[PDB]
C-alpha cells in the first residue's frame, strides 16, 4: 500500500510535496500516454512484507 515517487524532472525543494501522477518524460525522445520502454510511471510500491 505504501507507494513512493521515483521519477521527477529535478530535486524537489525542501519541505515540498509532489503528488503529480502525470507521466514523466523519462526518455530522450518524448512519448505521451501509457508507456512502453520509455515515459514510465513515477510511482513505485514498497514490497513491505514480514
Amino acid at each position: 500500500n505504501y507507494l513512493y515517487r521515483l521519477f521527477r524532472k529535478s530535486n524537489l525543494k525542501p519541505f515540498e510535496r509532489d503528488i503529480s501522477t502525470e507521466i514523466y518524460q523519462a526518455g530522450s525522445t518524448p512519448c505521451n500516454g501509457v508507456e512502453g520502454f520509455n515515459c514510465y510511471f513515477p510511482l513505485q510500491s514498497y514490497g513491505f512484507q514480514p
Partner: nanobody
Framework: VQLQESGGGLVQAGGSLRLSCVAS????????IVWFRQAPGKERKFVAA??????AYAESVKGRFTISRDNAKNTVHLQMNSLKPEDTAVYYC???????????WGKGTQVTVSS
Amino acid sequence: VQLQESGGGLVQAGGSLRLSCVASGRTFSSLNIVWFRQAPGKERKFVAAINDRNTAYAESVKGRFTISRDNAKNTVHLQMNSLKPEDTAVYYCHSADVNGGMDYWGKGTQVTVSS
C-alpha cells in the same frame, strides 16, 4: 474522509464491466484517482489515472479502457473493454489530496474472467 470500492462481478471474456469508486468527501475532483492492479498472489502494479486534464494507462490496458470522470458527483469510474482471462486481478483506486498529504485507500474488486 474515506473511500469505498464496490463492484467487480462475474463476467465473460470480452465483456464490459462498470466499477465505481465512490468517495466520502467534498473535493474529490481535485483528488485525482489512480487505479492499481494486484495479481492473485503475485507482485502489484498500476492500471490507470485520470489526473484531471489528461490520462495515463498501463501496458496491459493500453487504450483498451475508457476512463471516465464524474466531477458533478466527486466520484471516479473506469470502463472495462476487451477484457481478457489473463487480467484476473484485484483492481484498486486511490487519491491523495494536494494539501496535507493523506491517503484514502480502498479495499479492492475482483476481476475474475473466464476463458
